Amino acid sequence: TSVKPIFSRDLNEAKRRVRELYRAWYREVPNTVHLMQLDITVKQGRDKVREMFMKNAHVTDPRVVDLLVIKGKMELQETIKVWKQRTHVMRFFHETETPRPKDFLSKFYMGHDP
Amino acid sequence: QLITVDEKLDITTLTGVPEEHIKTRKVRIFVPARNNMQSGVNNTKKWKMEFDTRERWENPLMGWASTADPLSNMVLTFSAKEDAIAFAEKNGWSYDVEEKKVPKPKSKSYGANFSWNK
Amino acid sequence: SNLIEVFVDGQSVMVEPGTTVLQACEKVGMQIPRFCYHERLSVAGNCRMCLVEIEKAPKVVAACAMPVMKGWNILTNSEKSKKAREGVMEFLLANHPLDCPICDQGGECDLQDQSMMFGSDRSRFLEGKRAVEDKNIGPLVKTIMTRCIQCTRCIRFASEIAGVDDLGTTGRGNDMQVGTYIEKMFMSELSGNVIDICPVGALTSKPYAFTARPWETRKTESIDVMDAVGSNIVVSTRTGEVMRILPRMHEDINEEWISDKTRFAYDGLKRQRLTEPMVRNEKGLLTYTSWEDALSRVAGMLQNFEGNAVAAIAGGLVDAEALVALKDLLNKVDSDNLCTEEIFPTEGAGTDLRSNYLLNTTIAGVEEADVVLLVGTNPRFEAPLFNARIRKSWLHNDLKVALIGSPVDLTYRYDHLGDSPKILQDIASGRHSFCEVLKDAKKPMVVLGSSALQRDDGAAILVAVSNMVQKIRVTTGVAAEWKVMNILHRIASQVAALDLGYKPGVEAIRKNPPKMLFLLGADGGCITRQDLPKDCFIVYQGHHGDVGAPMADVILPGAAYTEKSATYVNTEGRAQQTKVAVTPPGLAREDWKIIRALSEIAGITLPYDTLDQVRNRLEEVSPNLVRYDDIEETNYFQQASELAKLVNQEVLADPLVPPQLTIKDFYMTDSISRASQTMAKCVKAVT
Amino acid sequence: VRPRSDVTHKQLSAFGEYVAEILPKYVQQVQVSCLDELEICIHPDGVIPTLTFLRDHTNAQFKSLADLTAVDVPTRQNRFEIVYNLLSLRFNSRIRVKTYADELTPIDSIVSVHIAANWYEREVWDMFGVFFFNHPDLRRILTDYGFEGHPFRKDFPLTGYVELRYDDEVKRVVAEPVELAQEFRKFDLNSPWEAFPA
Amino acid sequence: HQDLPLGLLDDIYEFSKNFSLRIDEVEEMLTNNRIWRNRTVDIGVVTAEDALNYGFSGVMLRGSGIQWDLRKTQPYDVYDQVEFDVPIGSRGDCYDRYLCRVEEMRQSLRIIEQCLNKMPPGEIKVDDAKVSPPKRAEMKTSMESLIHHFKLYTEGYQVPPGATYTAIEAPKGEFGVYLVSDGSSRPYRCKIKAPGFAHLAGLDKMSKGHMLADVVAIIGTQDIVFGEIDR
Amino acid sequence: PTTNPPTARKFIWTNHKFNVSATPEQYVPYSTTRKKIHEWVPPSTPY
Amino acid sequence: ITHTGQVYDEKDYRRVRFVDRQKEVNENFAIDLIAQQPVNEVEHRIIACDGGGGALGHPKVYINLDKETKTGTCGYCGLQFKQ
Amino acid sequence: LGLREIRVHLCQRSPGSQGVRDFIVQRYVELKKAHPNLPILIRECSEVQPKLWARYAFGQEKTVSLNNLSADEVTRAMQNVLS
Ligand code: SF4
Ligand code: SF4
Ligand code: FES
Ligand SMILES: [Zn+2]
């Protein structure tokens, strides 16, 4: 315990920042899908944003959250100030890779080490 | 002023590891033994934690070994058992520590070999 | 008290009187460069590469052989003690043949490194070198002895750790060659250890001659499954196939040594190995097919057959995790006919108290014993690293060994009470002579081998021994934590199987024949297809096609202990974990999953889906399985005897004889062993 | 055997004491290697203060920042060891000030003290993940635009987790989990025998 | 690694003898052309204190008049026994920096001359077999040498634990390696300070109030090779 | 080579070849190591 | 075929690699080429095989030709010598 | 309810287990003599309170905690299991 605060004194204040970033991404998804001529649906993309913002829903510690948005903000900057081209963005969608089943029987049938 | 958190530093969310290799990878914290070939003990000093071994299929074109597991060759070295356990907890990898086993003291004396009755 | 204070470079370490100068440096942490000194071998002083300089003393002293004295300062790194090493290393290297790119102890050399660290950078030996004729000491150890630094650790081990007393020094001068005077092979178990103990690469392993080089070898620490001592071992794997298995030290179980079987039968692990799941075709031959098809062949028969029509004869090297996955499956179709090939008498308390079937005096308790009553087993060939235990405790301590079996080569002086199971009654009556010898023993131990139990009167033999242990305990008045009765096994999956409540012996399957049989790694002839019902629908679950495969309607290949994170337990119940050194070959899969998957294809689906879960399962059925490296202290011998007293059986006059009478008996036993080309070469060498 | 002048090991040693005395609130340890190099060690809070004193003190002018780096000792609670190497063109001497930073306990930025650090601090964030407060524009410099994970951390696999190939179906470059055709052979090289007391 | 072949120093003399005319020739073709001067003079001026603050440390440091050469200030190797003049420029425009680079080529011919004139007879690698590998004949006739060759090639020097930042005047500027070393034969960290990571940072400040074309000159006058910057 | 002819060692080629890459004579890489895990072949005799 | 009996099975598909191409092998096989060289009949118990050419050869080693039955063979050249 | 096995996972030297172990010492033999086929398993857990696991027919397992229970309560609970 006894940790020093990075930018947010408590999960509460930190959550404020997450809200802002969500908004940012939400407002940006449409633009990217147009400035990058990505073949995705704005709605679809906006769900992806939600996915990511929740993939890390479990974090309880304020410090971890604060870094997470710093990093998140940095990603947005790379996508609104466009330095990240389609190949970079579409990677988020994991479009080419073949999905792996998580069913035990499925894995048994395919991989030595699951 | 400092803030209070009872949450075990877990930073699995910042490390940047693919989900599959954080929830399916068991690492073992062990002090390396000595290949019996040599009698030196300088490689049995520091604790090491090593990730579980994974597929090593033969390559069809040249017959070279091929591996799909990124964390295979990685063995991190930690000076003390407590510190290594900490690394597993904050990185979220499962751990199964093995106690160091050091040679027990053995009593030796050249005189014995010339014992009246051994 | 008894704590001198000696200074190692002024560190005031304190050591028991008797500690050598080398030992004093060790506790500070310094390591005297040493050759010819091994911790578990007698001090010889041959190399003199350990010369150190006690302060204010005219000459340098021999570390490994000098009793430390009060006040001495070791000056291990003194300019002098470096000339005393810069000048010895000059000599060892002078007559040495520089074939380091032949010497497969390339990176495993305690003489290059001790030369690269403690010796000089050049040479002044402008004279000629020597050469010593090589020797065909055996089919396992390649003695390119022109390499030998005459350090006499072999002659010690071959006399002190193993009782061979064959290797010896021959001649004097610079042509002292340490090889057998007449060419007689060094045939003994414990033989391969010489390789590991010769720091020079003079004699090294012949199978692992030139397959690798040590820096490359990835080293995974695992457990010996060939024998029930459960010796710790390190499996050295390169690019995914095992290259060598060499010992790793466990004070209590194998203290730096491993058997000849469990280090040259890694070759057997690579052939005759099952990989794809074949099924019996209409034509009547096993045809390779995908899991889905092979599994539902088995699942469909399983759903059709009810309890007591499905049975499992497990046995040999199967892990505890598969053993609980096979029991949980067959109970979900209500047959508890799960059984093991090795029959442990189960008419009184068997499998219920966990001391009827364990060597509960620890492997390290053979060191503090007083009289051992070996009854009906050849330890030399059933538990080689426990025979060594009684070897060390008969030499360094004073164990009085007595054998009631065949008079057999035991590497020590035993007393052959006789070859008759009924003379056990003779001692119980106090009639036989050794009855007093034990009376005189303050800490005695009986050891009943599993192979004596495998005869028909095994139930009677266990009961007869328990009676004698009872009055031995009463007459000696031995303390409770000292435990006289223990029984040693020779099958790795026997203590685990009995632990999970598997009932020993195929006697139950014999009385009612199952329509279905899961042979989980069983290559024994305990039941045969002629014996089975007409349907004879049995499915082999194992790694090597030996006896169970060609008489199998389904083949579900599994793995071996080099290829799975399974658990095993040796004879005094110390559970231990094998780690995956190499991924399992072909479509072959881990034993526990095949059975979890077959269950999902059957509709009773075992609750565990990840190893950690199969383990949690082991915890509910049994304690040892989850706590590793931890022998279980308390036992309930007194209630065991009460039930033994209720049991009435006749010990037949037929002498009790260990199946492994001589060493050719020993080399090929289990599946991996049988499949060994190295073991086969060893077998013909003996024959 | 290299020639060693003790003039320096004395000069530098003295300076070390001088710095320590002047900045006792932050200097924890000040050592001179056997290689005649000083290495004041400061509490992370002393980043701004200790540097500034060295950049602007008549008796210790350390105008240029040679380098900012972060070794990662995983065992150490504070994983990273930010090391700042500075040069004094006036006194022809270099000093190194090294602090400790854990993964989520950021260090102050010295872009104010030396603008050279604007880039190196971005380099330390990208590779090791330490964060620098008050940095003008902290953002990945060396790694790919979408890279996930900090690469020079000792806990990051060399080959990494993603590799790129061109896929026709999608007519665009596409990451896939790394599949290597000859894994890095991990030769074990440490010898079981030590060399000297050190 | 190996001794100079027996004809190299004569051939280096013949190259150095005639090389200066070759510098003289581009000297005439690109040093007074009004077109070069206009393209290079008064472009990317960097003030002296700003150059030290941005960690420029190179011809960029010397071009604005700061007098710093790690070859004379902190003499590494033998740079204490060779005589040369650091070509300090005065004003800092990309011309003064060019002129400095042309002078250093000339000053290096002065240092190369001294090295050919005064190269000592001797061995090319330290005689400690523990650090430098044993000679081919010795490893094939003496056991101590084969053991030392085998261990050095297979395992390594095993340098004593410590850390050092060593800077030499690489042509671009100060090139330094911060090598942190555990007692192991393989390093623990090796931070390559690249004269170039600092210089490229300066591009935004140096290329201020400048055209698209000036930026092409600004990168050119930093002598930036992206291998050093990217590492 | 005419003045000081080279050393002949009764294995060295007499017809040396140019780049055979586009022509069928080209190296096609192959593992030269033999099989490692021999398998249990099923009994061909019906039980 | 090759030095080590490396012959792709009649059903292996790496044989497709050799389709329309030459599987590179060398007619000159060492196992045989060393045999041709005759046993050197030295007259000293221990002789040395420097490898031929000294520094241009292999590490120097001394062979004990004492065993009357067999002949010493340099672990390097394979050259055999008998007393 | 077909009873197949009863597992008494006592924990040695544990305060609560005292009752369980006492049962083993005084009445185990008797129970076995009575039910001479049923397998009663005496096993030794650790840092866990004692559990009388019982396996009924067709792979159903049931749990009765024996933590801090007297010797006869352990006897009564065991007797309730094999009805
Ligand atoms: S033993 Fe083998 S390796 Fe060690 S030195 Fe002699 S030859 Fe070289
Ligand atoms: S053989 Fe190995 S052990 Fe026996 S003497 Fe020669 S060197 Fe010492
Ligand atoms: S170890 Fe001291 S005599 Fe060999
Ligand atoms: Zn030769």
What is the residue with the minimal CA distance to atom 8 of ligand 1? C100
DSSP 3-state of E44: coil
Task: Give the residue among C240, C273, C261 at the shortest CA–CA distance from C581.
Answer: C240
User: Is the shortest distance between the CB of C34 and ligand 3 below 6 Å?
Assistant: yes
Burial G9-28 (b: 16+ CB within 10 A, else e): eeeeebeebeeeeebeeeee
Q: State how far the Cα of E216 lies from the Cα of C260, in Å rounded to an integer.
A: 74
What is the chain B residue with the closest CA to G13? B60
Q: What are phi and psi of A25, to 5 degrees?
A: -60, -40
Probe residue for ligand 3, chosen from C38, C41, C42, C48 as the CB with the greatest number of ligand atoms within 8 Å: C48
Chains D and G touch each other (3 or more Cβ pairs < 8 A): no
Output the CA angle C427-C433-C439, nearest 5 degrees.
70
Residues 6+ apart with CB under 8 A from C584: A112, C558, C559, C560, C563, C564, C590
Query: Ion ligand 4 — residues with CB under 5 Å?
Result: G 49, 74, 76-77, 79
Q: Tell me the Ramachandran region of residue C203: left when phi exceeds 0, alpha when psi lies from -120 to 50, beta otherwise.
A: beta
C358, two tokens: 């364990």
Task: Give the residue among C355, C315, C272, C273 at the shortest CA–CA distance from C584.
Answer: C273
Determine the structural domain holding residue H5 and report its residue range.
1-83
Residues in chain D: 198
The sheet with strand C400-404 has its strands ordered as C414-418, C400-404, C371-375, C444-448, C485-486
Task: Give the residue among C152, C134, C153 at the shortest CA–CA distance from C144.
Answer: C134
What is the residue with the minimal CA distance to atom 4 of ligand 1? C109
Q: Do E146 and G59 touch (CB under 8 A)?
A: yes
DSSP 3-state of C333: coil
Output the CA angle B48-B54-B58, nearest 5 degrees.
125
Say if CB C200 and CB C152 are below 8 A apart: no
What is the fold, at CATH topology level, of the domain defined by E1-231? Cytochrome-c3 Hydrogenase; chain B (1.10.645)
DSSP H helices, G1-83, are 15-18, 30-36
Q: Do A105 and C609 touch (CB under 8 A)?
A: no
Determine the structural domain holding residue G69 and report its residue range.
1-83
Q: With contacts defined as CB-CB under 8 Å, which chain C residues touch G76?
A: 99, 102
> Closest to C270 (Cβ–Cβ): which among F36, F43, F46?
F36
CATH code assigned at H32 = 3.40.30.10
Q: With contacts defined as CB-CB under 8 Å, which chain A residues touch B72?
A: none
Residues 6+ apart with CB under 8 A from C530: none
Give me ligand 1 centre to Cα C446, in Å: 47
In terms of Cβ atoms closer than 10 Å to its own Cβ (0-12, 13-18, 19+), residue E118 is exposed
Residues in chain F: 47
Q: What domain count does chain G have?
A: 1
User: Is the shortest distance between the CB of C149 and ligand 2 below 6 Å?
Assistant: yes
Task: Give the residue among B23, B55, B25 at the shortest CA–CA distance from C590.
Answer: B55
Say if CB D117 and CB D111 are below 8 A apart: yes
Probe residue for ligand 1, chosen from C149, C200, C215 as the CB with the greatest number of ligand atoms within 8 Å: C200
Ligand 2 atom closest to Cα of residue C143: 1
HSE, side-chain direction, 13 A CA sphere, residue C171? 11
Probe residue for ligand 3, chosen from C23, C34, C198 as the CB with the greatest number of ligand atoms within 8 Å: C34
Measured over the CA atoms of residue C205, residue C206, residue C208 and residue C214, the dihedral's sign is positive
To the nearest 10 degrees (0 to 180), the angle between helices D47-55 and D6-22 is 120
Number of neighbouring beta carbons within 10 Å of residue A52: 14
User: Is the shortest distance between the CB of C246 and ligand 3 below 6 Å?
Assistant: no
User: Is the shortest distance between the CB of C37 and ligand 3 below 6 Å?
Assistant: yes
> Which stretch of DSSP H or E encloses residue D19?
helix D6-22
**DSSP collapsed to 3 states, C57-81:** CCCCEEHHHCECCCCCECCCCCHHH
DSSP 8-class letter at G15: H
Task: Give the residue among D26, D78, D80, D81 at the shortest CA–CA distance from D51.
Answer: D26
Q: State how far the Cα of C280 lies from the Cα of C299, in Å rounded to an integer.
A: 15
* Distance from the Cα of residue B102 to its chain's centroid: 16
**DSSP collapsed to 3 states, C228-263:** CCCCEEEEEEECCEEEEEEECCCCCCCCCCCCCHHH
Say if CB C107 and CB C215 are below 8 A apart: yes
> Which stretch of DSSP H or E encloses residue A51?
helix A42-55
E156, two tokens: 């390594």
Determine the structural domain holding residue A43 and report its residue range.
1-114
Q: Do C113 and D189 touch (CB under 8 A)?
A: no
Q: Where are the domains of chain E?
A: 1-231
Give me ligand 1 centre to Cα E141, in Å: 14
Ligand 2 atom closest to Cα of residue C197: 3
Q: Please name the method used to determine this structure.
A: cryo-EM
Q: State how far the Cα of H77 lies from the Cα of H83, in Å rounded to an integer.
A: 10
C286, two tokens: 């096993």
Residues 6+ apart with CB under 8 A from C44: C36, C37, C151, C152, C153, C156
Q: State how far the Cα of C210 lies from the Cα of C203, in Å rounded to an integer.
A: 13
D119, two tokens: 């880039």
Q: With contacts defined as CB-CB under 8 Å, which chain C residues touch F37?
A: 241, 270-271, 273, 275, 585-586
Give me ligand 3 centre to Cα C43, in Å: 8
User: Is the shortest distance between the CB of C100 and ligand 1 below 6 Å?
Assistant: yes
Q: With contacts defined as CB-CB under 8 Å, which chain B residues touch F34?
A: none
Number of neighbouring beta carbons within 10 Å of residue E132: 17
Resolution, angstroms, 1 dp: 3.2
> Closest to E148 (Cβ–Cβ): which among C111, C121, C215?
C121
DSSP 3-state of E9: helix
Q: What domain count does chain A have?
A: 1
What is the chain E residue with the closest CA to G57? E140
Task: Give the residue among C93, C9, C11 at the shortest CA–CA distance from C52.
Answer: C9
Q: State how far the Cα of C162 lies from the Cα of C159, in Å rounded to an integer.
A: 6
What is the chain E residue with the closest CA to C213? E154
Residues in chain B: 118
Q: State how far the Cα of C557 lies from the Cα of A100, in Å rounded to an integer.
A: 24
Q: Do D170 and A91 touch (CB under 8 A)?
A: no
Number of neighbouring beta carbons within 10 Å of residue F33: 11
> Closest to D192 (Cβ–Cβ): which among B17, B41, B72?
B41
Question: Does residue C131 sit at the G interface (CB-CB below 8 Å)?
Answer: yes
Q: Tell me the Ramachandran region of residue G5: left when phi exceeds 0, alpha when psi lies from -120 to 50, beta otherwise.
A: left
Q: Do G58 and E140 touch (CB under 8 A)?
A: yes
